[PDB]
Amino acid sequence: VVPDITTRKNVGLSHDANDFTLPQPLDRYSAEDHATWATLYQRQCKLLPGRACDEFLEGLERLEVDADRVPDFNKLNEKLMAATGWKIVAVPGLIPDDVFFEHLANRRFPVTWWLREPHQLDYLQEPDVFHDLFGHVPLLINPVFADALEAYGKGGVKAKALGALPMLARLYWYTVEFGLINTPAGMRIYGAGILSSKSESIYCLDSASPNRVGFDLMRIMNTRYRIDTFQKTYFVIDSFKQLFDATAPDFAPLYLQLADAQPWGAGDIAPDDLVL
C-alpha cells in the first residue's frame, strides 16, 4: 500500500473538518501543472466544438477560464458570482455526498484543487481541478442549469434522512456528470465527466454502442452506474428547463418506492424507456 494521489497532493495542508474546504493553495502549482492545464485545455477546446453544447463553450469564455495556467478560484468567482450568485470552493478531492449536496444547496461548487500529473494526461480516475473546474463550472453561468444544481443540493437533506443519497447521486451522475442534451443541430454534451474526457466525448455521440435514453427521473434514480468505464447508457434532456422542472415534486415517495426495487444495471434498457 502506497499513498494515493489525493493523499500525496494534500501533504502539509488541512481542510475544514465539517465542510471539507480550504483556501486554494496557489503556491503549490508548479510550472508542470500550468503546462498540464494548458495541454488539457487545448486538447478539449480542439475536440469539443460540435460536440459540447454551445452554452458550455460560451461559459468558458464568459468566466474567462485561463487557457494557459490553473485558474485562480477567487478571480473566477468574481465573474461567476455576478452571473448566478454561485462560487467555487476548493476541496482536497472526493468529499462525502452529504457535504457535497450541502455545498450545492448554498450555491457553492466544490472543486478539487490539485491537478493530475502529466503521465495521467489521458485519464485520471479521481476528480482533479481540470475535471472539476473545466468540466463542471462553465455551465454554472446558465441560470436554469444553476437553479437545477441548487435544487439537487437542497434535496440532500431529505435524501440523507431517508437513506436515499445514492438515489440522488444517480440523478447527479446521469445529468451533471454524463448528461446529453438534444438540439435541432443534433445531440450535444453537457455532462462534465464527458466534457473533460479525451475519448468519451467521441464515443458518446459517434458510437452506435451506447444506449441514448430520454430523461426520466424515476428510471434514472433506479439506475446503477460504473465509474471505471465509459457509460453504457446516456440520458438525454430536451432542455435545462427539463432538469430544473424534474426537481419540482416531492422526492420522498419516489425514494420509498425505489427502496425495495431492483435497480437497472448500467447497460439495461427498461421496458418503458424512450430509446433515441
The stretch among 44-52, 66-74, 173-181, 202-210 that binds Co ion (CB under 5 A) is 173-181
Pair 268, 224: CB distance under 8 Å? no
Residue with Cβ nearer Co ion (125 or 257): 125
Q: Is 194 a binder of Co ion (CB under 5 A)?
A: no
- Would you tell me how many other CB atoms lie within 10 Å of the CB of residue 274? 11
Closer residue to Co ion in complex, CB, 33/177 = 177
Q: Is the dihedral of CA 3, 137, 152, 48 positive or negative?
A: negative
Q: How far apart are CA 268 and CA 145, in angstroms?
A: 27
Q: Is the dihedral of CA 61, 108, 166, 242 positive or negative?
A: negative
Shortest distance (Å) from residue 148 CB to Co ion:
15
Class of residue 63 by CB neighbours under 10 A (exposed 0-12, middle 13-18, buried 19+): buried
> 175 or 258, CB closer to Co ion?
175
Q: Which is nearer to Co ion, 102 or 177 (CB)?
A: 177
Interface residue with Co ion among 192, 195, 220, 258 (CB under 5 A) is 192
The nearest distance, CB 81 to Co ion, in angstroms, is 21
**Interacting residues toward Co ion by CB under 5 A:** 177, 192
Annotated binding site for Fe cation: 131, 136, 177
Q: Could you list the residues known to form a binding site, using ranges.
A: 131, 136, 177
